Amino acid sequence: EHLAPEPAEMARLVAGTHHNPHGILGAHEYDDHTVIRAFRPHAVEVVALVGKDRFSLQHLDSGLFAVALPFVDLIDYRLQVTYEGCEPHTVADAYRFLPTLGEVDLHLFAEGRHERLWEVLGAHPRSFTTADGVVSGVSFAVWAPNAKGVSLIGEFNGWNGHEAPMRVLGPSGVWELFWPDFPCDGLYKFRVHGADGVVTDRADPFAFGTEVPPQTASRVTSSDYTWGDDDWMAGRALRNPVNEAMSTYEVHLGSWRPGLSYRQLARELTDYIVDQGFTHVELLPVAEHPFAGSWGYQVTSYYAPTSRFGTPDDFRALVDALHQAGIGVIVDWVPAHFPKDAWALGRFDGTPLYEHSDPKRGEQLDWGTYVFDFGRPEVRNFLVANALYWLQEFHIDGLRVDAVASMLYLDYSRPEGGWTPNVHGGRENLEAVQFLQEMNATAHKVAPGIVTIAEESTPWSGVTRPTNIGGLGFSMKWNMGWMHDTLDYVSRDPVYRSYHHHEMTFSMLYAFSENYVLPLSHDEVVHGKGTLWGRMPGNNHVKAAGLRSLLAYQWAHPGKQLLFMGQEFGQRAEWSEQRGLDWFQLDENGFSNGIQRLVRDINDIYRCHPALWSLDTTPEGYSWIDANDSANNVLSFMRYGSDGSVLACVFNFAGAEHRDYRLGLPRAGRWREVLNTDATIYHGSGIGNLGGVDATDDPWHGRPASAVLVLPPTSALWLTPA
Numbered sequence: 001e002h003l004a005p006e007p008a009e010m011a012r013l014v015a016g017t018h019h020n021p022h023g024i025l026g027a028h029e030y031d032d033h034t035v036i037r038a039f040r041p042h043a044v045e046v047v048a049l050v051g052k053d054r055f056s057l058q059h060l061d062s063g064l065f066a067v068a069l070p071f072v073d074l075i076d077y078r079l080q081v082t083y084e085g086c087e088p089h090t091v092a093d094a095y096r097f098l099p100t101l102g103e104v105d106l107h108l109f110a111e112g113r114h115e116r117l118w119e120v121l122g123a124h125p126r127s128f129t130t131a132d133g134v135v136s137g138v139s140f141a142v143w144a145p146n147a148k149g150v151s152l153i154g155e156f157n158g159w160n161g162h163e164a165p166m167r168v169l170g171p172s173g174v175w176e177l178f179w180p181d182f183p184c185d186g187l188y189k190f191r192v193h194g195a196d197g198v199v200t201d202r203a204d205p206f207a208f209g210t211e212v213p214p215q216t217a218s219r220v221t222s223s224d225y226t227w228g229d230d231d232w233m234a235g236r237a238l239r240n241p242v243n244e245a246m247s248t249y250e251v252h253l254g255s256w257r258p259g260l261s262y263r264q265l266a267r268e269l270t271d272y273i274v275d276q277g278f279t280h281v282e283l284l285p286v287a288e289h290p291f292a293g294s295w296g297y298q299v300t301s302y303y304a305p306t307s308r309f310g311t312p313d314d315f316r317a318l319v320d321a322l323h324q325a326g327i328g329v330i331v332d333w334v335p336a337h338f339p340k341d342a343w344a345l346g347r348f349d350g351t352p353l354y355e356h357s358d359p360k361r362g363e364q365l366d367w368g369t370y371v372f373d374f375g376r377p378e379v380r381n382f383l384v385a386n387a388l389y390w391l392q393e394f395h396i397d398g399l400r401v402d403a404v405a406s407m408l409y410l411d412y413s414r415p416e417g418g419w420t421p422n423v424h425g426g427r428e429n430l431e432a433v434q435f436l437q438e439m440n441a442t443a444h445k446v447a448p449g450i451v452t453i454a455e456e457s458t459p460w461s462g463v464t465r466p467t468n469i470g471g472l473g474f475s476m477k478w479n480m481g482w483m484h485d486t487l488d489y490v491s492r493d494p495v496y497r498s499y500h501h502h503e504m505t506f507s508m509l510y511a512f513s514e515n516y517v518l519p520l521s522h523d524e525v526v527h528g529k530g531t532l533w534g535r536m537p538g539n540n541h542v543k544a545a546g547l548r549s550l551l552a553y554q555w556a557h558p559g560k561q562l563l564f565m566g567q568e569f570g571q572r573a574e575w576s577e578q579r580g581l582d583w584f585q586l587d588e589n590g591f592s593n594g595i596q597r598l599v600r601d602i603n604d605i606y607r608c609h610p611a612l613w614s615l616d617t618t619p620e621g622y623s624w625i626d627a628n629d630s631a632n633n634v635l636s637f638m639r640y641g642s643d644g645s646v647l648a649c650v651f652n653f654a655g656a657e658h659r660d661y662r663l664g665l666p667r668a669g670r671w672r673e674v675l676n677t678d679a680t681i682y683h684g685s686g687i688g689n690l691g692g693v694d695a696t697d698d699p700w701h702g703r704p705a706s707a708v709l710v711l712p713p714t715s716a717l718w719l720t721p722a
Contacts, residue, residue, distance in 0.1 A: 002030040003066045005037075013039060014063060014162065017148040017193050021165040021177075026095035027074055034074050036067040038081075038093065040163040045082040049090065050074065063162070076131035092135040092180040099169055099176055100126060100139040106172045109143075112377025115446065117385035118303060118393070121174070122206030123220045125184055138182035138220050140166065142204065143378055144349035145173030146195035152177055153201065154188035154217070166190075173349075173378075185209070187217040189343075194350020203343055205382070207301045210288045212308060216343050218301070225313045229323035229395060236397060236449040241328075242475055242515050243642075245613040246560035247603050248330065249278040249568070250521055253309060254292055256565055258580040262305075262314035266321040273327055276596070277603025280328040282400060282562060284522065286315065287334075290341060295522070295577060297337050297402070300344040302386045305394075312394075319395050330398035330453065331390060335383050335435075336407050338370035346370060354379050365413065371406070375431035384439050391447045398451035398475075399443070405458040407432040433472065440473025451475040453517060464515040479516040479559055482507040487524065490550050491535040494633065494655035494714070501630030504653075507557070508627070515617050516559035525564060525575050533570040538714075542655065544570065544591035545684055545714040548598045548677040549651060552716035555602045556639060556649040558616050569596040594683035605674055605718065610641035625650070625664050626701050632658055634711065638666065647674075648719040652711035657687050659710050664703030668695045670722035671707060678712030687712035692722065 004010065005024050012018040013025075027036045036056075038046050041063035048056035048067050058065030077096075082088040101120060108114035109121075121143065127136040140152055152164040166177040175190075182188075190202045203210070209221030227233075253265065260268060273281055285296025288306045296306075305315040322329050338355055339345040345354045356373040359366050373379045390396045411427045440452050455478040456463050465471025489497065489504045497504075525531045532550060536543035547570050554561050566581040569592040573582060585592040606612050615621020625636035625648065633653040640646055648665060652658060665671065672692045678684030693707040700706035711717065 002035060003068055004060055004064065010061065010064070012149075013165070014041075015193075016151050016162055016165060016191065016199075018165055019149060020167045022095045022167050026093055027077075029072060032072055033068065033070045034072055036074075036077070036093075038065045038079055039063060039165075040065070040081050041161075042083065043081055044084060045080075045088070047080050049078045049080060078132060092130070092137075094137075094164075094177065094179050097128065097178045099167075100178050101141055101169060101174065101176055106169060106174060109174070109378060109381060110172065112379075112381040112384075114381055114385060115388055115442065117381055118206060118208070118389050122204060122208060122303070123188070123218070125220065125222050126178065135180055137178055137180040138184075138186070139176070139178045140188075140190075140204075141174055141176045142166070142190050142202075142206075143174050143382075144168075144190075144192055144353070146351045146353070147175070147192050147349040148195065148197075149193040150175040151191040151193075152179060152188060153191045154182075154186055156182070156186070159189070159201075183220065184222070185220055187211055187219050189217050192349060194347070196347075196350040198350060201343060202348065203300060205302075205345060205348070207288070207304050209312060210301050210304050210307050213288075213290050213292075213306075216290070216300075216341075218304075219307075221304070221312055223313055223316070223393075225316045227316070227320055227395065229320050232323040232326070233395065236328075237447075239449050241398070241449070241451045242617060243614060245279050245607050246328075246517070247278045247555070247606055248280045248282050248517070248560065248562040249273055249276065250282045250284070250562055250564040252284040252295060252522065252565065252575075252577055253286065253306075254296075255575075255577040255580050257583075260309070262310040262318045265309070266318045269318070270321045270325050270327065273322070274325050275600070276568060277600050277607065278327070279607065280330055280397075281322060282330040282398075283332065285332045285334055292577060296332065297334055298339065299334050299337060300339045300341055302382075303389055316394060323395065328397040329395075330400055330451070331396050333387060333390070333399040333401050335372060335401060335439075336403040338372055340370060354382070367412075373431075374407075374429070374435035380435050380438070383435065384442055387439050387443050387452075388446055391443060391450055396450075398453060400453040400455065401436075401474075402455045404436070404454045404456045404463075404472075405460070407436070408456075408460060409458070436472045436474075437467045441467045444473070444475075453477065455480070455519075461513070476515040476517050476560065478519045478521075478562075479507065479511075479514075480519075482511070482516070482518050482557070482559070483520065483524065486550070486553070487520075487532075487535060490546060490653075491537070493537045494653065497633045497653050498630045501628075501633065505627050505635065508622070508624075511558045511622075512617060512619055517562050518554050518557055518559040519562040520554065520564065520567060521562060522564045522575060525567065525571075527574070529574075531571055531574060532567050533572050534574075538655065540591060541683075541685075542714060544595060545678065547595055548682055548684070549653070549714055549716045551595075551599060552602055552649075552675065552677055552718070553635075553651055555606055556612065556637075556647075556716070556718065558622050558639075560613070560616065563599075568599045569593070591683050594681070598677060598682045602675065609645065609647060609720070610643050611639045611645045611647040611720075612641075614642040615640055623666075625703065632661075634658065634661070636663060646720065650711060650717045650719075652713060652715050652717075655713050657710060657713045660708055661711050662698075662700050662706050662708050664699070664701030664706045665695045666703065666705070667721055668697050668705040671695055671719040672722050673717060674720055675716065675718035676712065677717075678715040684712060684715065687715075689717075693719070
């Protein structure tokens with residue numbers, strides 16, 4: 001009776017709903033005689049090979065085969081399946097191998113505290129030395145607690161095989177399987193039989209490699225890449241970004257220069273950034289995403305760089321090249337977005353596994369909007385380990401998390417009938433908060449010197465406050481208020497700016513309540529908002545002057561900077577990832593070359609003048625010269641470095657020049673004019689002070705000394721003591 005399993009088991013094995021294939025398949029001893037079974041539908045001949053005896057052959061059931069035959073122990077053997085049109089092939093029996101995942105790793109995962117989860121889950125090539133020699137293949141592991149079964153499918157199965165069922169490892173919910181001689185770079189998917197009876201073919205949540213979109217299969221990927229950035233990595237651990245220079249060039253890899261691969265970008269993008277003077281590059285989501293129109297935010301393979309531009313190692317070469325050129329690399333990380341594709345993460349095991357669940361069928365306030373269940377240990381681990389993954393496996397220097405507000409709040413609908421303030425269970429998602437704190441604390445602990453950046457649109461405070469005192473633990477946050485007030489102000493015609501002077505200086509009131517990055521990102525130059533150039537008032541010459549002023553203002557204002565590709569040369573039309581950037585503008589007889597030149601100059605002054613970045617987070621690094629000259633639309637202030645250095649910045653937002661303008665200063669003597677956005681080299685009108693001014697001992701604006709100078713119209717002047 002112990003030759004062919006019972007009908008119930010046999011039915012499950014053929015329907016792919018057996019939880020423990022290895023219990024039936026492989027070699028099993030009943031009383032004495034060792035029985036060997038192999039499941040391979042549409043097979044013609046199996047036969048087992050023991051030592052030097054072909055002593056076997058099998059042939060019963062509806063796809064199953066059994067050897068039976070006496071003698072015990074056996075100790076290693078090999079099968080030789082055969083089909084029509086093809087020749088036999090001797091392969092080791094997968095179901096004879098022990099689990100390729102230890103109890104310890106599973107325990108850490110169950111607790112949601114495995115810091116190197118990527119080495120445990122997913123597809124990893126492995127080799128075992130048995131009796132008849134060493135056997136190589138690939139180990140597979142997927143988390144799916146409520147699935148009735150998971151089978152491995154791929155090119156070898158015609159993407160519809162059944163002879164590769166996986167087993168679940170106890171109550172862990174993790175399915176495992178070692179497939180002898182599976183291709184080192186083979187494509188594959190996990191056919192999942194959900195708890196709801198629905199079968200789905202899934203990409204691997206831990207895919208380290210992927211098929212090029214629109215294809216959706218995962219690809220086994222193992223790296224042995226040799227990095228040439230040891231110096232950069234060792235240096236990074238000894239610095240604190242918050243107190244260092246940070247001029248960021250935000251880039252979307254697919255549309256910066258359409259058609260470039262990672263290897264080409266490793267040359268072109270690196271050289272571009274170096275020549276423009278940026279200290280860092282911030283990349284829009286690099287993880288695999290099926291739709292380019294999402295710009296990368298709708299990720300499906302969190303553990304794999306998009307294959308559109310090359311292989312993972314090719315991506316490492318891009319990061320490696322930037323590092324050797326002295327450029328830091330920040331990547332947009334998307335824990336706030338949840339994959340909606342049926343072959344991705346939604347209802348993975350037939351239940352809302354990864355996404356936060358809610359009440360069952362019925363009316364009430366139950367909607368969709370898929371968000372990760374930060375309350376679940378394994379889901380939290382999936383995300384926290386992914387952050388660590390990119391920082392350690394790809395040497396990424398920082399992570400920027402968008403839409404954090406959508407993570408911190410469960411909110412919806414404004415109640416009626418309840419006119420009383422009720423706390424208890426506020427709108428705050430305590431699970432998400434705990435998740436962000438863990439992610440930050442763990443990341444900064446494992447990779448000192450990296451930065452985590454958050455974009456939070458709500459009045460939430462302590463975003464960049466240490467986790468040990470209630471903060472979310474982020475190194476920095478986007479100053480959205482500065483961006484909105486600044487762009488609203490510069491968009492208004494000069495004759496009206498006086499009415500919004502207070503709007504322009506409002507950001508200074510809380511500029512030190514957090515470690516800020518002043519941003520002018522991709523989101524502000526799409527969907528009818530127009531570009532920075534489009535927002536500027538006046539003719540081409542005045543728009544250009546206004547843009548050069550804005551950028552100078554962004555750089556001088558307390559906080560780090562971030563500028564989206566194309567805007568450094570005043571791209572006129574809104575960004576389009578489908579058309580690419582408007583580089584032709586640099587070939588026109590326009591102002592674009594002049595704006596790009598200004599950015600190079602402010603970046604150059606910036607990097608070499610600690611007064612612009614050493615004291616960004618404290619009032620000590622700033623000082624108003626005159627915050628109340630709304631009558632002339634002029635803003636002036638000092639920036640101070642931790643090395644005692646200084647820089648005076650004067651912005652003239654009026655459309656006309658101001659001659660004989662007296663500016664109060666800290667010291668007397670000669671002040672060198674290090675920047676004048678009206679200089680003819682930028683294609684301004686050339687109004688200036690001839691390189692510098694002499695500050696006399698005539699007190700002004702409550703200052704001990706002052707100097708008389710001309711302020712070019714719609715411009716910015718920066719000065720430093722000679």
